[PDB]
Amino acid sequence: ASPEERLLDELNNVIVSFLCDSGSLEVERCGAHVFSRGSSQPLCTVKLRHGQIYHLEFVYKFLAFKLKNCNYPSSPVFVISNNGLATTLRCFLHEPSGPCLGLSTDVDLPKNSIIMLGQDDFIKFKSPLVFPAELDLLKSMVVCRAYITEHRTTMQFLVFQAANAQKASRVMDMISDMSQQLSGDRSHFSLRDFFRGISANFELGKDFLREMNTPIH
After folding, report:
1. Residues 6+ away with beta carbon under 8 Å from 76
2. 115 and 79 in contact (C-beta within 8 Å)?
3. Spans of all domains in the chain
4. Where is this protein chiefly located (predicted)?
């Protein structure tokens, strides 16, 4: 299982590289049944940390892109759950009880409750908050700021955009040019081209996340 192992390696390392942007990230991986239909094996588990921001939409869509490139039919699922000792993010490569909560600006997350995030949940969250031209991940991205205290756990979902439109556009140019060089104009630039370019140089992904820094009003 080397082709499988390489893909699983890459998927885990997308999370490691892009879920945050600073500090020690506590990412645990673990069975030959991560891809198997009907399995409840997550790819990895991440302990969330008070005050940190997690780039859920970007990582989600990056994982979805790699899976479709490998002809894998399922789309990932993120599960945030609080067991009373800690809040974790579990990244499943497919859909795998306690109250299951939906996305909103402030999701109180008591013990034994979960939040499930899937393919269209980020667009549904953004849809009423941003104008149509800003709806795509390239312009507006959903993040999660963790609020974890002894007396309350709360997942705070925010939409971030670039404050500097010119610098954001310059990063897009670099990514587009990287995609064009791998395949050998701006009018065709797609989410696939975006992740193809970032796949070739992760630093371009870091550049994008760095510019997507301002919560919407």
Report:
1. 60, 63, 64, 67, 91, 92, 93, 94, 118
2. yes
3. 2-161
4. host cell
Q: Give exposure, 39-66, as e/b (b: 16+ Cβ within 10 Å).
A: eebbbbbbebbeebbbbbbbbbbbbbbb
CA distance 60 to 50: 21
Structure method = X-ray
Q: Which residues contact 204 (CB under 8 A, 6 or more apart)?
A: 171, 174, 175, 178, 197, 198
Contact 91, 80 (CB under 8 A): no
Secondary structure (DSSP) of 177-192: HHHHHHH---TT--HH
Contact 58, 209 (CB under 8 A): yes
**What resolution in Å is listed for this PDB structure?**
1.6
> In whole angstroms, what is the distance from residue 3 CA to residue 197 CA?
22
Give me the residue label for tokens 């556009």.
169
